[PDB]
A paper describes a structure:
Fungal degradation of lignin, a key step in carbon recycling in land ecosystems, has been described as an ‘enzymatic combustion’, in which high redox-potential haem peroxidases – the so-called lignin peroxidases (LiPs), manganese peroxidases (MnPs) and versatile peroxidases (VPs) – play a central role. Recent evolutionary studies show that MnPs evolved from fungal generic peroxidases (similar to plant peroxidases) by developing an Mn-binding site formed by three acidic residues near the haem propionates, as shown in the first MnP crystal structure. The genome of [name] includes 13 manganese peroxidase (MnP) genes representative of the three subfamilies described in ligninolytic fungi, which share an Mn2+-oxidation site and have varying lengths of the C-terminal tail. We have solved the crystal structure of the extralong MnP6 from [name] after its heterologous expression.
Author numbering: -1 to 364
The structure:
């Protein structure tokens, strides 16, 4: 039967109401209403938790979106491909005992949905509940890495859950709110687009610009040249320059994926809806949805998309594009004014001094 939660929310199932206080605690204790570092980490964790599953190897290889990262924090978070995932894992573990009726698998996915809701332009994703509260650790080798080629990436996603090339590119819209701490050992929080606190299509445009240098070292595995490498970290600042992943570059230019990649440029609603659909599929890997219950109503309404059009960042323009898609013309867009690169802020408030919640815990890094 239907019910009304303590916050006034109408749900199709009263068990959904347990998630209301969980969302409140996730915000008050970790996410702080922001599309910031901790939100980004948790969204990355939804993927590392979910994708560790394989049709061809069978169920013993991993249970998908099963909370295995939280329940066995000494195993998967320390595999090489998950270096750095410990921060999100250690931030979520305490919620398992604070909200003991909610499984680790549900916790990971619900935290991701709440985190996304803090990001202007992000979709309000589906949330199904009821993932069982026990599993085993996945094997190593199931998480794509940034040095991987497109054939490998596409095969891994197909084997994980039958994702199509379009769905893979759609999921990578998440790199619109993403930075790197481990790719370059000399850099912290190197952003993948110029708006890492905004769920927009800048990532799609900016990967298509010609690379001109590196924000740090020039020879890191999985990294390629960036179109906007300038930061202020050489003078002690925290506004790290923009980083480009080899995998994002490869997706942007491969015949299977390049038109899907370009098709999101300046198509905010199409991008966000496409991400939402593929992400809902990711979130239930390892489960038959018939065995889950719809608790989508308890995902917070996301911050609205920003008013700002999609534009070329200062000092760039259409002459800098490297295009690969014949099927669709790249749209005419304005160029942000300015003679030098604009520093990409380290914080959603535009400053450099913001700090993030980090709980101690059992997962480790490097
Ligand atoms: C081919 C598939 C993918 C590859 C190779 C990849 C690679 C990476 C790498 C190397 C980083 C930086 C980690 C670090 O050094 O700190 C990163 C960050 C991130 N990834 Fe991906 N990723 C992929 C797919 C996805 C998907 C499917 C999602 C979610 C739907 C996702 C969400 C994120 C987020 C939110 C971050 C930022 C984390 C932070 O700023 O703390 N990624 N990814
Ligand atoms: Ca898992
Ligand atoms: Ca962005
Ligand atoms: Na990070």
């Amino acid at each position: 039967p239907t019910a009304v939660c303590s916050d006034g929310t109408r749900v199709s199932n009263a068990v959904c109401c347990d998630f209301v206080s969980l969302g409140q605690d996730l915000q008050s204790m970790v996410l702080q209403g922001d599309c910031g570092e901790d939100a980004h980490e948790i969204i990355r964790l939804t993927f590392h938790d979910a994708v560790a599953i394989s049709r061809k190897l069978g169920p013993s290889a991993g249970g998908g979106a099963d909370g295995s990262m939280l329940l066995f924090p000494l195993v998967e978070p320390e595999f090489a491909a998950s270096n750095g995932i410990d921060d999100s894992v250690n931030n979520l573990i305490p919620f398992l005992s604070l909200h003991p009726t909610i499984s680790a698998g549900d916790l990971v996915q619900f935290a991701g949905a709440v985190a996304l809701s803090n990001c202007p332009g992000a979709p309000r994703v589906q949330f199904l509940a009821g993932r069982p509260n026990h599993t085993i650790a996945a094997i190593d080798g199931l998480i794509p890495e940034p040095q991987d080629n497109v054939t490998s990436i596409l095969e891994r996603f197909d084997d994980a859950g039958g994702f199509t090339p379009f769905e893979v590119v759609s999921l990578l819209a998440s790199h619109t709110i993403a930075r790197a701490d481990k790719v370059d050992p000399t850099l912290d929080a190197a952003p993948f687009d110029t708006t890492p606190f905004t769920f927009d299509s800048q990532i799609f445009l900016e990967v298509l610009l010609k690379g001109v240098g590196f924000p740090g070292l020039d020879n890191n595995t999985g990294e390629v040249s960036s179109p906007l490498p300038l930061g202020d970290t050489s003078t002690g600042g925290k506004d790290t320059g923009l980083m480009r992943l080899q995998s994002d570059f490869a997706l942007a230019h491969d015949p299977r994926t390049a038109c899907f990649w370009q098709g999101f440029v300046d198509q905010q609603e199409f991008m966000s809806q496409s991400f939402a659909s593929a992400f809902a599929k990711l979130a239930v890997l390892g489960h038959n949805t018939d065995d889950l219950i719809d608790c989508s109503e308890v995902v917070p309404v996301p911050k609205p998309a920003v008013d700002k059009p999609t534009t070329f960042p200062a000092t760039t323009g259409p002459q800098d594009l490297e295009l690969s898609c014949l099927a669709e013309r790249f749209p005419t867009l304005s160029v942000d004014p300015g003679a030098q690169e604009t520093l990409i802020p380290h914080c959603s408030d535009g400053l450099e001094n913001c700090t993030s919640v980090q709980f101690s815990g059992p997962a480790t890094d490097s």
